PDB file of all heavy atoms in Angstrom:
ATOM      1  N   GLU A   1     -32.880  20.387 -45.073  1.00 24.38           N
ATOM      2  CA  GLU A   1     -33.706  19.411 -44.643  1.00 24.38           C
ATOM      3  C   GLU A   1     -34.560  18.818 -45.626  1.00 24.38           C
ATOM      4  O   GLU A   1     -34.957  17.660 -45.599  1.00 24.38           O
ATOM      5  CB  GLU A   1     -34.497  19.733 -43.373  1.00 24.38           C
ATOM      6  CG  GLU A   1     -33.676  20.093 -42.083  1.00 24.38           C
ATOM      7  CD  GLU A   1     -33.516  18.898 -41.003  1.00 24.38           C
ATOM      8  OE1 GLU A   1     -33.119  17.735 -41.360  1.00 24.38           O
ATOM      9  OE2 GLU A   1     -33.518  19.209 -39.798  1.00 24.38           O
ATOM     10  N   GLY A   2     -34.980  19.522 -46.619  1.00 24.40           N
ATOM     11  CA  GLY A   2     -36.023  19.053 -47.562  1.00 24.40           C
ATOM     12  C   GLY A   2     -36.319  20.310 -48.470  1.00 24.40           C
ATOM     13  O   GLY A   2     -35.805  21.401 -48.369  1.00 24.40           O
ATOM     14  N   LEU A   3     -37.163  19.930 -49.486  1.00 26.57           N
ATOM     15  CA  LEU A   3     -37.602  20.904 -50.512  1.00 26.57           C
ATOM     16  C   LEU A   3     -38.334  22.092 -49.942  1.00 26.57           C
ATOM     17  O   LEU A   3     -37.957  23.251 -50.248  1.00 26.57           O
ATOM     18  CB  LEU A   3     -38.391  20.404 -51.687  1.00 26.57           C
ATOM     19  CG  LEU A   3     -38.501  21.222 -52.824  1.00 26.57           C
ATOM     20  CD1 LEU A   3     -37.195  21.653 -53.423  1.00 26.57           C
ATOM     21  CD2 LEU A   3     -39.485  20.515 -53.873  1.00 26.57           C
ATOM     22  N   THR A   4     -39.293  21.837 -49.129  1.00 25.70           N
ATOM     23  CA  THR A   4     -39.977  22.859 -48.425  1.00 25.70           C
ATOM     24  C   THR A   4     -39.151  23.810 -47.687  1.00 25.70           C
ATOM     25  O   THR A   4     -39.156  25.140 -47.683  1.00 25.70           O
ATOM     26  CB  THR A   4     -41.201  22.325 -47.455  1.00 25.70           C
ATOM     27  OG1 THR A   4     -42.031  21.727 -48.286  1.00 25.70           O
ATOM     28  CG2 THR A   4     -41.895  23.474 -46.962  1.00 25.70           C
ATOM     29  N   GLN A   5     -38.277  23.219 -46.884  1.00 22.14           N
ATOM     30  CA  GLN A   5     -37.339  23.941 -46.077  1.00 22.14           C
ATOM     31  C   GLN A   5     -36.396  24.859 -46.806  1.00 22.14           C
ATOM     32  O   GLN A   5     -36.096  26.019 -46.468  1.00 22.14           O
ATOM     33  CB  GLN A   5     -36.664  23.024 -45.020  1.00 22.14           C
ATOM     34  CG  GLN A   5     -37.590  22.260 -44.232  1.00 22.14           C
ATOM     35  CD  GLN A   5     -38.021  20.784 -44.680  1.00 22.14           C
ATOM     36  OE1 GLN A   5     -38.382  20.505 -45.825  1.00 22.14           O
ATOM     37  NE2 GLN A   5     -38.258  20.028 -43.665  1.00 22.14           N
ATOM     38  N   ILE A   6     -35.897  24.364 -47.838  1.00 21.73           N
ATOM     39  CA  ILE A   6     -34.966  25.129 -48.709  1.00 21.73           C
ATOM     40  C   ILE A   6     -35.691  26.367 -49.339  1.00 21.73           C
ATOM     41  O   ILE A   6     -35.109  27.477 -49.240  1.00 21.73           O
ATOM     42  CB  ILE A   6     -34.242  24.161 -49.736  1.00 21.73           C
ATOM     43  CG1 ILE A   6     -32.835  24.651 -50.004  1.00 21.73           C
ATOM     44  CG2 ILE A   6     -34.959  23.993 -50.945  1.00 21.73           C
ATOM     45  CD1 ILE A   6     -32.011  23.588 -50.697  1.00 21.73           C
ATOM     46  N   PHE A   7     -36.925  26.191 -49.806  1.00 23.84           N
ATOM     47  CA  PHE A   7     -37.697  27.379 -50.352  1.00 23.84           C
ATOM     48  C   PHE A   7     -38.100  28.301 -49.188  1.00 23.84           C
ATOM     49  O   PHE A   7     -38.209  29.455 -49.494  1.00 23.84           O
ATOM     50  CB  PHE A   7     -38.718  26.915 -51.300  1.00 23.84           C
ATOM     51  CG  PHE A   7     -38.205  26.699 -52.593  1.00 23.84           C
ATOM     52  CD1 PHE A   7     -37.698  25.457 -53.034  1.00 23.84           C
ATOM     53  CD2 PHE A   7     -37.987  27.786 -53.530  1.00 23.84           C
ATOM     54  CE1 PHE A   7     -37.136  25.275 -54.249  1.00 23.84           C
ATOM     55  CE2 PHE A   7     -37.438  27.458 -54.728  1.00 23.84           C
ATOM     56  CZ  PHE A   7     -37.009  26.228 -55.071  1.00 23.84           C
ATOM     57  N   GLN A   8     -38.359  27.750 -48.126  1.00 23.64           N
ATOM     58  CA  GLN A   8     -38.713  28.626 -46.840  1.00 23.64           C
ATOM     59  C   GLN A   8     -37.463  29.534 -46.533  1.00 23.64           C
ATOM     60  O   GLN A   8     -37.644  30.634 -46.179  1.00 23.64           O
ATOM     61  CB  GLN A   8     -39.201  27.736 -45.733  1.00 23.64           C
ATOM     62  CG  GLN A   8     -39.469  28.621 -44.389  1.00 23.64           C
ATOM     63  CD  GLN A   8     -40.765  29.404 -44.630  1.00 23.64           C
ATOM     64  OE1 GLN A   8     -41.837  28.941 -44.916  1.00 23.64           O
ATOM     65  NE2 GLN A   8     -40.658  30.820 -44.319  1.00 23.64           N
ATOM     66  N   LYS A   9     -36.247  28.888 -46.454  1.00 22.13           N
ATOM     67  CA  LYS A   9     -35.154  29.636 -46.187  1.00 22.13           C
ATOM     68  C   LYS A   9     -34.854  30.707 -47.238  1.00 22.13           C
ATOM     69  O   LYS A   9     -34.472  31.835 -46.944  1.00 22.13           O
ATOM     70  CB  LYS A   9     -33.891  28.761 -46.076  1.00 22.13           C
ATOM     71  CG  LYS A   9     -33.934  28.105 -44.692  1.00 22.13           C
ATOM     72  CD  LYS A   9     -32.450  27.608 -44.551  1.00 22.13           C
ATOM     73  CE  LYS A   9     -32.186  27.072 -43.190  1.00 22.13           C
ATOM     74  NZ  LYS A   9     -31.486  25.871 -43.305  1.00 22.13           N
ATOM     75  N   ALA A  10     -35.023  30.306 -48.562  1.00 20.72           N
ATOM     76  CA  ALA A  10     -34.815  31.175 -49.626  1.00 20.72           C
ATOM     77  C   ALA A  10     -35.813  32.441 -49.582  1.00 20.72           C
ATOM     78  O   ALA A  10     -35.385  33.442 -49.664  1.00 20.72           O
ATOM     79  CB  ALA A  10     -34.953  30.511 -50.948  1.00 20.72           C
ATOM     80  N   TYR A  11     -36.998  32.143 -49.286  1.00 23.47           N
ATOM     81  CA  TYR A  11     -37.926  33.229 -49.146  1.00 23.47           C
ATOM     82  C   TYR A  11     -37.692  34.124 -48.022  1.00 23.47           C
ATOM     83  O   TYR A  11     -37.769  35.363 -48.252  1.00 23.47           O
ATOM     84  CB  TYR A  11     -39.439  32.559 -49.006  1.00 23.47           C
ATOM     85  CG  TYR A  11     -40.511  33.523 -48.748  1.00 23.47           C
ATOM     86  CD1 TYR A  11     -40.774  34.610 -49.547  1.00 23.47           C
ATOM     87  CD2 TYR A  11     -41.382  33.471 -47.727  1.00 23.47           C
ATOM     88  CE1 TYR A  11     -41.761  35.537 -49.406  1.00 23.47           C
ATOM     89  CE2 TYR A  11     -42.292  34.385 -47.384  1.00 23.47           C
ATOM     90  CZ  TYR A  11     -42.549  35.486 -48.351  1.00 23.47           C
ATOM     91  OH  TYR A  11     -43.489  36.230 -48.183  1.00 23.47           O
ATOM     92  N   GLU A  12     -37.400  33.630 -46.849  1.00 21.21           N
ATOM     93  CA  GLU A  12     -36.959  34.548 -45.758  1.00 21.21           C
ATOM     94  C   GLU A  12     -35.751  35.289 -46.042  1.00 21.21           C
ATOM     95  O   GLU A  12     -35.575  36.402 -45.726  1.00 21.21           O
ATOM     96  CB  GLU A  12     -36.732  33.688 -44.603  1.00 21.21           C
ATOM     97  CG  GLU A  12     -37.997  33.302 -43.978  1.00 21.21           C
ATOM     98  CD  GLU A  12     -37.842  31.978 -42.780  1.00 21.21           C
ATOM     99  OE1 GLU A  12     -36.634  31.757 -42.522  1.00 21.21           O
ATOM    100  OE2 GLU A  12     -38.833  31.422 -42.470  1.00 21.21           O
ATOM    101  N   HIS A  13     -34.765  34.665 -46.816  1.00 23.95           N
ATOM    102  CA  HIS A  13     -33.662  35.230 -47.305  1.00 23.95           C
ATOM    103  C   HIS A  13     -34.000  36.480 -48.136  1.00 23.95           C
ATOM    104  O   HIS A  13     -33.404  37.657 -48.091  1.00 23.95           O
ATOM    105  CB  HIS A  13     -32.642  34.404 -47.913  1.00 23.95           C
ATOM    106  CG  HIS A  13     -31.474  34.986 -48.290  1.00 23.95           C
ATOM    107  ND1 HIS A  13     -30.474  35.437 -47.445  1.00 23.95           N
ATOM    108  CD2 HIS A  13     -31.041  35.421 -49.550  1.00 23.95           C
ATOM    109  CE1 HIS A  13     -29.541  36.073 -48.108  1.00 23.95           C
ATOM    110  NE2 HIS A  13     -29.828  36.156 -49.372  1.00 23.95           N
ATOM    111  N   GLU A  14     -34.899  36.272 -49.151  1.00 23.05           N
ATOM    112  CA  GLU A  14     -35.259  37.312 -50.018  1.00 23.05           C
ATOM    113  C   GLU A  14     -36.078  38.513 -49.223  1.00 23.05           C
ATOM    114  O   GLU A  14     -35.865  39.683 -49.541  1.00 23.05           O
ATOM    115  CB  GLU A  14     -36.246  36.840 -51.124  1.00 23.05           C
ATOM    116  CG  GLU A  14     -35.488  35.895 -52.086  1.00 23.05           C
ATOM    117  CD  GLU A  14     -34.452  36.489 -52.807  1.00 23.05           C
ATOM    118  OE1 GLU A  14     -34.669  37.822 -53.229  1.00 23.05           O
ATOM    119  OE2 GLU A  14     -33.514  36.035 -53.199  1.00 23.05           O
ATOM    120  N   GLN A  15     -36.809  38.107 -48.320  1.00 20.57           N
ATOM    121  CA  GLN A  15     -37.488  39.183 -47.430  1.00 20.57           C
ATOM    122  C   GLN A  15     -36.356  40.087 -46.738  1.00 20.57           C
ATOM    123  O   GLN A  15     -36.538  41.233 -46.578  1.00 20.57           O
ATOM    124  CB  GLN A  15     -38.358  38.635 -46.300  1.00 20.57           C
ATOM    125  CG  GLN A  15     -39.575  37.981 -47.040  1.00 20.57           C
ATOM    126  CD  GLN A  15     -40.349  37.313 -45.959  1.00 20.57           C
ATOM    127  OE1 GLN A  15     -40.036  36.159 -45.372  1.00 20.57           O
ATOM    128  NE2 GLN A  15     -41.375  37.827 -45.480  1.00 20.57           N
ATOM    129  N   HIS A  16     -35.294  39.433 -46.196  1.00 16.72           N
ATOM    130  CA  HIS A  16     -34.190  40.121 -45.659  1.00 16.72           C
ATOM    131  C   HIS A  16     -33.542  41.039 -46.614  1.00 16.72           C
ATOM    132  O   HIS A  16     -33.209  42.191 -46.279  1.00 16.72           O
ATOM    133  CB  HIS A  16     -33.182  39.159 -44.907  1.00 16.72           C
ATOM    134  CG  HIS A  16     -31.925  39.975 -44.515  1.00 16.72           C
ATOM    135  ND1 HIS A  16     -30.743  39.770 -45.155  1.00 16.72           N
ATOM    136  CD2 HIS A  16     -31.760  40.740 -43.427  1.00 16.72           C
ATOM    137  CE1 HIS A  16     -29.842  40.594 -44.469  1.00 16.72           C
ATOM    138  NE2 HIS A  16     -30.493  41.195 -43.509  1.00 16.72           N
ATOM    139  N   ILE A  17     -33.255  40.614 -47.775  1.00 20.46           N
ATOM    140  CA  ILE A  17     -32.655  41.436 -48.921  1.00 20.46           C
ATOM    141  C   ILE A  17     -33.612  42.618 -49.186  1.00 20.46           C
ATOM    142  O   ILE A  17     -33.155  43.730 -49.246  1.00 20.46           O
ATOM    143  CB  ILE A  17     -32.325  40.672 -50.067  1.00 20.46           C
ATOM    144  CG1 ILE A  17     -31.387  39.501 -49.949  1.00 20.46           C
ATOM    145  CG2 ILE A  17     -31.895  41.619 -51.318  1.00 20.46           C
ATOM    146  CD1 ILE A  17     -30.058  40.076 -49.412  1.00 20.46           C
ATOM    147  N   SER A  18     -34.894  42.446 -49.241  1.00 21.77           N
ATOM    148  CA  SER A  18     -35.837  43.505 -49.533  1.00 21.77           C
ATOM    149  C   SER A  18     -35.746  44.562 -48.437  1.00 21.77           C
ATOM    150  O   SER A  18     -35.708  45.806 -48.742  1.00 21.77           O
ATOM    151  CB  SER A  18     -37.274  42.947 -49.515  1.00 21.77           C
ATOM    152  OG  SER A  18     -37.423  42.195 -50.639  1.00 21.77           O
ATOM    153  N   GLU A  19     -35.690  44.178 -47.163  1.00 19.60           N
ATOM    154  CA  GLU A  19     -35.487  45.067 -46.047  1.00 19.60           C
ATOM    155  C   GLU A  19     -34.251  45.873 -46.093  1.00 19.60           C
ATOM    156  O   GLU A  19     -34.349  46.950 -45.893  1.00 19.60           O
ATOM    157  CB  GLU A  19     -35.482  44.461 -44.669  1.00 19.60           C
ATOM    158  CG  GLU A  19     -36.746  43.577 -44.245  1.00 19.60           C
ATOM    159  CD  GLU A  19     -36.362  42.858 -42.881  1.00 19.60           C
ATOM    160  OE1 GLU A  19     -35.798  43.434 -41.961  1.00 19.60           O
ATOM    161  OE2 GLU A  19     -36.752  41.574 -42.796  1.00 19.60           O
ATOM    162  N   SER A  20     -33.110  45.172 -46.478  1.00 21.91           N
ATOM    163  CA  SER A  20     -31.868  45.884 -46.510  1.00 21.91           C
ATOM    164  C   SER A  20     -31.964  46.997 -47.668  1.00 21.91           C
ATOM    165  O   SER A  20     -31.407  47.997 -47.396  1.00 21.91           O
ATOM    166  CB  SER A  20     -30.707  44.873 -46.663  1.00 21.91           C
ATOM    167  OG  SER A  20     -30.725  44.344 -47.912  1.00 21.91           O
ATOM    168  N   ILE A  21     -32.534  46.659 -48.721  1.00 20.17           N
ATOM    169  CA  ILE A  21     -32.683  47.746 -49.732  1.00 20.17           C
ATOM    170  C   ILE A  21     -33.647  48.861 -49.384  1.00 20.17           C
ATOM    171  O   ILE A  21     -33.287  49.998 -49.547  1.00 20.17           O
ATOM    172  CB  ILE A  21     -33.222  47.125 -51.008  1.00 20.17           C
ATOM    173  CG1 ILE A  21     -32.265  46.130 -51.713  1.00 20.17           C
ATOM    174  CG2 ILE A  21     -33.541  48.201 -52.033  1.00 20.17           C
ATOM    175  CD1 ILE A  21     -32.961  45.322 -52.666  1.00 20.17           C
ATOM    176  N   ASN A  22     -34.775  48.466 -48.655  1.00 19.58           N
ATOM    177  CA  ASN A  22     -35.583  49.503 -48.043  1.00 19.58           C
ATOM    178  C   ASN A  22     -34.854  50.431 -47.099  1.00 19.58           C
ATOM    179  O   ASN A  22     -35.026  51.733 -47.063  1.00 19.58           O
ATOM    180  CB  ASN A  22     -36.811  49.048 -47.329  1.00 19.58           C
ATOM    181  CG  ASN A  22     -37.796  48.476 -48.254  1.00 19.58           C
ATOM    182  OD1 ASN A  22     -37.821  48.847 -49.423  1.00 19.58           O
ATOM    183  ND2 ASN A  22     -38.628  47.528 -47.759  1.00 19.58           N
ATOM    184  N   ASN A  23     -33.895  49.953 -46.277  1.00 19.69           N
ATOM    185  CA  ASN A  23     -33.003  50.739 -45.485  1.00 19.69           C
ATOM    186  C   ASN A  23     -32.142  51.650 -46.255  1.00 19.69           C
ATOM    187  O   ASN A  23     -32.017  52.812 -45.809  1.00 19.69           O
ATOM    188  CB  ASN A  23     -32.164  49.771 -44.615  1.00 19.69           C
ATOM    189  CG  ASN A  23     -31.367  50.431 -43.622  1.00 19.69           C
ATOM    190  OD1 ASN A  23     -30.197  50.275 -43.625  1.00 19.69           O
ATOM    191  ND2 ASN A  23     -31.918  51.249 -42.709  1.00 19.69           N
ATOM    192  N   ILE A  24     -31.581  51.267 -47.322  1.00 18.86           N
ATOM    193  CA  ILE A  24     -30.789  52.127 -48.141  1.00 18.86           C
ATOM    194  C   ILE A  24     -31.627  53.295 -48.729  1.00 18.86           C
ATOM    195  O   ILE A  24     -31.225  54.472 -48.713  1.00 18.86           O
ATOM    196  CB  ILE A  24     -30.025  51.450 -49.375  1.00 18.86           C
ATOM    197  CG1 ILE A  24     -29.265  50.265 -48.862  1.00 18.86           C
ATOM    198  CG2 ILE A  24     -29.091  52.415 -49.927  1.00 18.86           C
ATOM    199  CD1 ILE A  24     -28.609  49.322 -49.922  1.00 18.86           C
ATOM    200  N   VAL A  25     -32.850  52.869 -49.223  1.00 17.45           N
ATOM    201  CA  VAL A  25     -33.717  53.896 -49.852  1.00 17.45           C
ATOM    202  C   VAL A  25     -34.155  55.010 -48.869  1.00 17.45           C
ATOM    203  O   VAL A  25     -34.255  56.200 -49.122  1.00 17.45           O
ATOM    204  CB  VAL A  25     -34.933  53.179 -50.481  1.00 17.45           C
ATOM    205  CG1 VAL A  25     -35.884  54.259 -50.991  1.00 17.45           C
ATOM    206  CG2 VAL A  25     -34.592  52.388 -51.605  1.00 17.45           C
ATOM    207  N   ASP A  26     -34.439  54.421 -47.552  1.00 23.17           N
ATOM    208  CA  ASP A  26     -34.782  55.334 -46.642  1.00 23.17           C
ATOM    209  C   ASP A  26     -33.751  56.290 -46.225  1.00 23.17           C
ATOM    210  O   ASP A  26     -33.890  57.428 -46.018  1.00 23.17           O
ATOM    211  CB  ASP A  26     -35.218  54.536 -45.436  1.00 23.17           C
ATOM    212  CG  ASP A  26     -35.902  55.383 -44.396  1.00 23.17           C
ATOM    213  OD1 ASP A  26     -36.958  56.099 -44.633  1.00 23.17           O
ATOM    214  OD2 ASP A  26     -35.224  55.489 -43.382  1.00 23.17           O
ATOM    215  N   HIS A  27     -32.467  55.883 -46.153  1.00 22.65           N
ATOM    216  CA  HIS A  27     -31.314  56.678 -45.971  1.00 22.65           C
ATOM    217  C   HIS A  27     -31.051  57.641 -47.038  1.00 22.65           C
ATOM    218  O   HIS A  27     -30.778  58.738 -46.836  1.00 22.65           O
ATOM    219  CB  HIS A  27     -30.071  55.948 -45.688  1.00 22.65           C
ATOM    220  CG  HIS A  27     -29.802  55.547 -44.315  1.00 22.65           C
ATOM    221  ND1 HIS A  27     -30.432  54.513 -43.697  1.00 22.65           N
ATOM    222  CD2 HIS A  27     -28.950  56.037 -43.423  1.00 22.65           C
ATOM    223  CE1 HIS A  27     -30.021  54.305 -42.532  1.00 22.65           C
ATOM    224  NE2 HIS A  27     -29.081  55.180 -42.229  1.00 22.65           N
ATOM    225  N   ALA A  28     -31.360  57.303 -48.281  1.00 21.48           N
ATOM    226  CA  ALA A  28     -31.241  58.194 -49.484  1.00 21.48           C
ATOM    227  C   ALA A  28     -32.277  59.494 -49.241  1.00 21.48           C
ATOM    228  O   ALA A  28     -31.855  60.492 -49.439  1.00 21.48           O
ATOM    229  CB  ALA A  28     -31.397  57.448 -50.787  1.00 21.48           C
ATOM    230  N   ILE A  29     -33.537  59.110 -48.844  1.00 23.20           N
ATOM    231  CA  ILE A  29     -34.463  60.199 -48.569  1.00 23.20           C
ATOM    232  C   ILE A  29     -33.938  61.087 -47.579  1.00 23.20           C
ATOM    233  O   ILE A  29     -34.010  62.264 -47.680  1.00 23.20           O
ATOM    234  CB  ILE A  29     -35.813  59.561 -48.240  1.00 23.20           C
ATOM    235  CG1 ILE A  29     -36.435  58.942 -49.512  1.00 23.20           C
ATOM    236  CG2 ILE A  29     -36.721  60.570 -47.600  1.00 23.20           C
ATOM    237  CD1 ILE A  29     -37.605  58.091 -49.212  1.00 23.20           C
ATOM    238  N   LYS A  30     -33.502  60.580 -46.366  1.00 24.85           N
ATOM    239  CA  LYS A  30     -33.121  61.344 -45.303  1.00 24.85           C
ATOM    240  C   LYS A  30     -31.844  62.216 -45.587  1.00 24.85           C
ATOM    241  O   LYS A  30     -31.735  63.301 -45.168  1.00 24.85           O
ATOM    242  CB  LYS A  30     -32.554  60.425 -44.112  1.00 24.85           C
ATOM    243  CG  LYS A  30     -33.725  59.800 -43.386  1.00 24.85           C
ATOM    244  CD  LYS A  30     -33.236  58.575 -42.435  1.00 24.85           C
ATOM    245  CE  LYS A  30     -34.137  58.118 -41.320  1.00 24.85           C
ATOM    246  NZ  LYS A  30     -35.568  57.652 -41.886  1.00 24.85           N
ATOM    247  N   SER A  31     -30.912  61.739 -46.475  1.00 23.38           N
ATOM    248  CA  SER A  31     -29.841  62.584 -46.796  1.00 23.38           C
ATOM    249  C   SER A  31     -30.110  63.318 -48.017  1.00 23.38           C
ATOM    250  O   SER A  31     -29.259  63.932 -48.513  1.00 23.38           O
ATOM    251  CB  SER A  31     -28.623  61.731 -46.935  1.00 23.38           C
ATOM    252  OG  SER A  31     -28.654  60.826 -48.002  1.00 23.38           O
ATOM    253  N   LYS A  32     -31.310  63.383 -48.575  1.00 22.31           N
ATOM    254  CA  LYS A  32     -31.657  64.025 -49.830  1.00 22.31           C
ATOM    255  C   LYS A  32     -30.856  63.641 -51.034  1.00 22.31           C
ATOM    256  O   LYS A  32     -30.609  64.526 -51.909  1.00 22.31           O
ATOM    257  CB  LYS A  32     -31.565  65.568 -49.673  1.00 22.31           C
ATOM    258  CG  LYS A  32     -32.410  66.017 -48.466  1.00 22.31           C
ATOM    259  CD  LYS A  32     -32.314  67.587 -48.272  1.00 22.31           C
ATOM    260  CE  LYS A  32     -32.994  67.968 -46.880  1.00 22.31           C
ATOM    261  NZ  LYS A  32     -32.832  69.424 -46.749  1.00 22.31           N
ATOM    262  N   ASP A  33     -30.428  62.431 -51.056  1.00 20.10           N
ATOM    263  CA  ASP A  33     -29.714  61.914 -52.217  1.00 20.10           C
ATOM    264  C   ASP A  33     -30.549  61.242 -53.194  1.00 20.10           C
ATOM    265  O   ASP A  33     -30.788  60.173 -53.392  1.00 20.10           O
ATOM    266  CB  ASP A  33     -28.698  60.929 -51.669  1.00 20.10           C
ATOM    267  CG  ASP A  33     -27.701  60.455 -52.828  1.00 20.10           C
ATOM    268  OD1 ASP A  33     -27.719  60.845 -54.012  1.00 20.10           O
ATOM    269  OD2 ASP A  33     -26.754  59.806 -52.505  1.00 20.10           O
ATOM    270  N   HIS A  34     -31.182  62.160 -53.949  1.00 21.71           N
ATOM    271  CA  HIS A  34     -32.175  61.806 -54.869  1.00 21.71           C
ATOM    272  C   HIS A  34     -31.607  60.965 -56.085  1.00 21.71           C
ATOM    273  O   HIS A  34     -32.374  60.236 -56.659  1.00 21.71           O
ATOM    274  CB  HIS A  34     -33.274  62.805 -55.232  1.00 21.71           C
ATOM    275  CG  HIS A  34     -34.066  62.914 -53.993  1.00 21.71           C
ATOM    276  ND1 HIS A  34     -35.118  62.168 -53.754  1.00 21.71           N
ATOM    277  CD2 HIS A  34     -33.905  63.803 -52.917  1.00 21.71           C
ATOM    278  CE1 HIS A  34     -35.587  62.492 -52.577  1.00 21.71           C
ATOM    279  NE2 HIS A  34     -34.863  63.469 -52.012  1.00 21.71           N
ATOM    280  N   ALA A  35     -30.428  61.221 -56.506  1.00 23.66           N
ATOM    281  CA  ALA A  35     -29.826  60.535 -57.543  1.00 23.66           C
ATOM    282  C   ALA A  35     -29.719  59.065 -57.210  1.00 23.66           C
ATOM    283  O   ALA A  35     -30.064  58.173 -58.023  1.00 23.66           O
ATOM    284  CB  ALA A  35     -28.536  60.992 -58.074  1.00 23.66           C
ATOM    285  N   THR A  36     -29.265  58.746 -55.974  1.00 24.83           N
ATOM    286  CA  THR A  36     -29.160  57.441 -55.407  1.00 24.83           C
ATOM    287  C   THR A  36     -30.595  56.803 -55.302  1.00 24.83           C
ATOM    288  O   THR A  36     -30.787  55.691 -55.690  1.00 24.83           O
ATOM    289  CB  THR A  36     -28.387  57.373 -54.096  1.00 24.83           C
ATOM    290  OG1 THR A  36     -27.020  57.887 -54.362  1.00 24.83           O
ATOM    291  CG2 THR A  36     -28.271  55.927 -53.635  1.00 24.83           C
TER     292      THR A  36
END
């Protein structure tokens, strides 16, 4: 729709990626996979 909206979507998308990585990290702690 416009420049604001594109960067709003991009930012939300980056927040989602950050969460998805946090989820992996959390699982590595739970499974004691320190190398990962």
